[PDB]
């Protein structure tokens with residue numbers, strides 16, 4: 001049916017979503033799950049802040065719809081089409097790039113097609129498991145330990161790291177034969193719904 005999650009709103013804005021939820025029998029909740037159909041983002045006149053419910057909503061190929069969908073529907077006294085209120089961007093993508101759009105559609109071809117991803121080392125604003133769930137949702141396979149990468153030709157190993165959090169290293173290459181990228185690779189790739197070329201995110205691996 002319809003399950004809504006909400007992001008970046010104030011209490012008085014949450015209340016309007018609540019009103020809208022009651023009028024149209026839409027379950028409204030706090031946490032985002034697979035069962036959620038809609039993510040309601042706060043936007044400007046339709047770019048939003050990159051949030052966890054934003055990445056996960058896109059990762060699930062959901063309706064990542066601007067808060068304007070609600071108030072306009074409240075004002076026009078019926079459920080408007082999500083189509084005309086869907087979010088277009090953030091800071092990885094200004095105004096137009098169609099992150100959520102590529103995603104609602106593409107579910108056949110997922111950006112992390114046949115990939116083995118390892119979120120290695122400490123992580124901060126984005127928990128290891130949230131990045132893992134994100135990465136899984138885009139079609140990848142999660143590896144927990146560097147030595148657990150499949151010894152088979154068909155998959156490509158990637159090591160995702162968040163530099164700031166440690167005090168990972170430049171010595172991952174010493175423990176495995178995988179490209180090591182910064183977590184921004186995952187975040188952008190998901191934001192934009194297009195697998196980013198590892199090139200700009202690769203980290204110095206010391207021989």
Ligand SMILES: [Co+2]
Pocket residue numbers: 156
């Ligand atoms: Co290849």
